Point group: C3
Chain length 222, copies 3
């Protein structure tokens, strides 16, 4: 449309749709209960992202937020996506290493706090307070990354695949607070069209790339 | 009140309230942990529906949505109901057959996508896009119905009761997208008062009727 | 600020932040999976409350609701807090006694209904209907308290700690509907600044006080 960022919302919609259908077909037949869990979790992630990219593409998941005396276009649908897809991504990691339930609830709850405070930050109309919420969300993110590294006798197959996905997760997820800080939600240094491109590449990599690595590994089977 | 549909919201409120109290009393005493699960799940469903019917009856769960150049009365509280009650109904089915956790997460997540895209469709102000969301929600519904039929050594008691509830579920749930399509959320072929009657009969049947069948079966006991 | 109640939102923010960091540090090292669960649950509660107190303090979690012909300041962020923190508090109790899953789902679902109908009551613009929602929420609360007392061979260590936390829970949680009834959400007998003080003392006691009792007990270890 008239929104220059439309092309990246359209490409992200397509890519998440295609990833969803690929993983759907791929998991057809799988009978191992353990593998079944990883396919469900991992197919659901880009399915949810597909709907929220389409909602941005059609204009539904966009609102205007007054701050710095302007009307700032804020895509809130990203936070409805991430609210469900980032704990699912963490559950994939957690199941892979057989984490303790206490550790899984710490991770999902820290993740809820990360996304919910990012959403409050995104909708806050007092510009300086936006970055108070950024900082608290960043601190929740660093707790999560801490736990993925210092909280975890795996069969060597598990260990290997987990190490790769853990490194993929730390590098990609750490970029999100930087994009938000420099982008239209934060300091406004990078235009919305380039921010939207950055988040499209991260999201597709963190969902479809991550899941291609995982669903190719024998680590997901008993 | 002045809303002609008030009578059906009032009758649905009453019927869900009465079903809730019936199942509450009925489960009193039950000590079998397995049965306890089915009573909790099955009592909670019409309890939640009671609150959301009452919220429609009092006007709280109604909003106006501009589309086709008019101010369309949209009862959004139905989606807050269904968001929680339809996965609970699916958990009742899933526990009955002892489904794999992977299969249960596929079902709840597809259900979330069904209701959340129905809600976006219900609130979308570009009329043609309303039916894009309908189609995606319908596709999620057909995945769910697919899985209830082709994804599942039960004791014969389980099998029998599950087959009846599965057929009840396919027939009733399949009517919802048709009512939405022809009703005030969609093409506007059927007036809101008759739509509200249709959804009242479906909801009471899918909640209180379904639960009367289930909570009468010995299938829920170890 | 100019809101007289600011001081109690500031003190509650501080106290929940300090409790969160205390329990975070305290649980460092714990390796017992059972204890790990109680630390996760119990650290998350004041972490979530911290964010929602800060959101009230900065003005984000406050809205104006017209009722009784005025513009009533309603802090809705309390309900986003309680939606997650009160089932977590109930899970702490439930895990302590090894409750049946049926019993845990009854408790979380009744809790959802308690907070969600309190939120509808808080935002309802027809003054008399506000108290219809209060009554239904109160009835959900009495079901929960009923179950904590008449629904539950514990090692004596569990029993002892559970009895203390159960009495703490009945006394503190029972005060919330009274504060709401006499406060700005209800009859408006007590000013918002004193209501906000009452809820700060209850919340800190029900979260940080409760958790100090629990995380000091050996009951949380296998
Ligand atoms: C757990 C564990 C831990 C909990 C984390 C603690 C932090 C909780 C914060 C959360 C609070 C939510 C705030 C939000 C609902 C309030 C919206 O009001 C806005 C601010 O003026 C209005 O903007 C205009 C509109 C805005 C749009 C916001 C909508 C978003 C919707 C995302 C939710 C999705 C759920 C799918 C529903 C179907
Ligand atoms: C920070 C602590 C660790 C955590 C405590 C929470 C406080 C978070 C805020 C930190 C910082 C003050 C925020 C204040 C930004 C300030 C420069 C605003 C600039 O002033 C202008 C008018 O006053 C704002 O208009 C518009 C000007 C804008 C274009 C300026 C953008 C502001 C930028 C803020 C960037 C924050 C990061 C650098 C944090 C990295 C650590
Ligand atoms: C570091 C830790 C908490 C930092 C304490 C700061 C104290 C600020 O006091 C006044 C400074 O003018 C704020 O009042 C001025 C009015 C405004 C009030 C701001 C107070 C809050 C914004 C700070 C509450 C804690 C913060 C948390 C920063 C994120 C954390 C996760 C790193
Ligand atoms: C966005 C990309 C970084 C673009 C820059 C290109 C850099 C190349 C990839 C980044 C890094 C790659 C990590 C390799 C991994 C290998 C480590 O395996 C170790 C052996 O068990 C695990 O222990 C310990 C594991 C340790 C590994 C942690 C990786 C680091 C995390 C970097 C943070 C992120 C990038 C910061 C965002 C930036 C874009 C603002
Ligand atoms: C999971 C697994 C899978 C997730 C599924 C993917 C699809 C996610 C979509 C969801 C997004 C939610 C959208 C909604 C919150 C945004 C509301 O803004 C409206 C649109 O202009 C404003 O209408 C005016 C008001 C409207 C009213 C909407 C309110 C509704 C509330 C229902 C939620 C309930 C939660 C109980 C809370 C107590
Ligand atoms: C069938 C599958 C996806 C269908 C692809 C279609 C392609 C439409 O391209 C243009 C036709 O004018 C839409 O741009 C015109 C502007 C508008 C853009 C509409 C594109 C989206 C509405 C379609 C995205 C996928 C759809 C999913 C339909 C539901 C699915 C679950 C059956
Ligand atoms: C809303 C009602 C249909 C009103 C119309 C009256 C029709 C009578 C009931 C509908 C049907 C009844 C199904 C009977 C069942 C018996 C099948 O058991 C089989 C043996 O294991 C199960 O295998 C395979 C099971 C197969 C059974 C699937 C049932 C069919 C599903 C029909 C879709 C729904 C109706 C479409 C909605 C319409 C109202 C627009
Ligand atoms: C389960 C099991 C059981 C379910 C219980 C049954 C009762 C369900 C009721 C719920 C319905 C939610 C209503 C609400 C979303 C509708 C908001 O519209 C308001 C009323 O005019 C507008 O006020 C203006 C704004 C208001 C602010 C409301 C926002 C609140 C947000 C709290 C949710 C949090 C989620 C964290 C998200 C990140
Ligand atoms: C109640 C049943 C058990 C459950 C069924 C649900 C019905 C709930 C409502 C019960 C009660 C009628 C509500 C009516 C309050 C009524 C006195 C309102 C006062 O009239 C004034 C103008 O008409 C209201 O303006 C302003 C005047 C205000 C300052 C008056 C405040 C009203 C108070 C209501 C208090 C309710 C409790 C006493 C319930 C304790 C049991
Ligand atoms: C006690 C139980 C249910 C009580 C039934 C009452 C019947 C009220 O009928 C009319 C009285 O004028 C209400 O219509 C007047 C228009 C208004 C309609 C109000 C009807 C609803 C407010 C009552 C629905 C049930 C209530 C539940 C009260 C809370 C319960 C949990 C104790
Ligand atoms: C807000 C406070 C009450 C302020 C008033 C000061 C009163 C002192 C504390 C209240 C009470 C203390 C309860 C002691 C406990 C001991 C009971 O242990 C029993 C032995 O197993 C448990 O069986 C059965 C256990 C039984 C115990 C239930 C306690 C009672 C619950 C009281 C309801 C609350 C207060 C009503 C709210 C009021 C503030 C409007
Ligand atoms: C059969 C396999 C390999 C998958 C192909 C199905 C299509 C869907 C997406 C899968 C590919 C993505 C790999 C993740 C990595 C990336 C960094 C994603 C960033 C996207 C940018 C565009 C580059 C090309 C693509 C259009 C595939
Ligand atoms: C003891 C048993 C049988 C239950 C009676 C308690 C009351 C609550 C509801 C239970 C009855 C409903 C059966 C479900 C089937 C239907 C198709 C429901 C559609 C409702 C339409 C009105 C018909 C009559 C009723 C008011 C019972
Ligand atoms: C090391 C221990 C004891 C904890 C201290 C860390 C600080 C955070 C909060 C812990 C203290 C609270 C106990 C709960 C009981 C109360 C009734 C809370 C009501 C608060 C009112 C103010 C009273 C003093 C306080 C500022 C500690
Ligand atoms: C599928 C998409 C994924 C994996 C997205 C991850 C998003 C985050 C890690 C977001 C982090 C943020 C912060 C740490 C700071 C505040 C802003 C956020 C929400 C962008
Ligand atoms: C308790 C009520 C139940 C069982 C309701 C079920 C609702 C559905 C199956 C709704 C389905 C819909 C679609 C498939 C298309 C879009 C509109 C919906 C949400 C009505
Ligand atoms: C961390 C805070 C806790 C433990 C808060 C508990 C809140 C309740 C028990 C609230 C109860 C309410 C009712 C019973 C009636 C309606 C109003 C409420 C939501 C305040």
């Amino acid at each position: 449309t008239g929104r220059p960022e439309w092309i990246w919302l359209a490409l992200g919609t397509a890519l998440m749709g295609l990833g969803t259908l690929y993983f759907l077909v791929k998991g057809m037949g799988v009978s191992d209960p353990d593998a079944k869990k990883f396919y469900a979790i991992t197919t659901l992630v880009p399915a949810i992202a597909f709907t929220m990219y389409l909602s941005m593409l059609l204009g539904y998941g966009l609102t205007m937020v007054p701050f710095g005396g302007e009307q700032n276009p804020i895509y809130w649908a990203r936070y409805a996506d991430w609210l469900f897809t980032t704990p699912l991504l963490l559950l994939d990691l957690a199941l892979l290493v057989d984490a303790d339930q206490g550790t899984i609830l710490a991770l999902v709850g820290a993740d809820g706090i990360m996304i919910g405070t990012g959403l409050v930050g995104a909708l806050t109309k007092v510009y300086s307070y936006r970055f108070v919420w950024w900082a608290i969300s960043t601190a929740a993110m660093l707790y999560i990354l801490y736990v993925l590294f210092f909280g975890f006798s795996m069969r060597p197959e598990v260990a290997s695949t987990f190490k790769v996905l853990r490194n993929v997760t730390v590098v990609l997820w750490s970029a999100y607070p930087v994009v938000w800080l420099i982008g239209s939600e934060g300091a406004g240094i990078v235009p919305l069209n380039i921010e939207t491109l950055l988040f499209m590449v991260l999201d597709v990599s963190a969902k479809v790339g991550f899941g291609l690595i995982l669903l190719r590994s024998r680590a997901i089977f008993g």
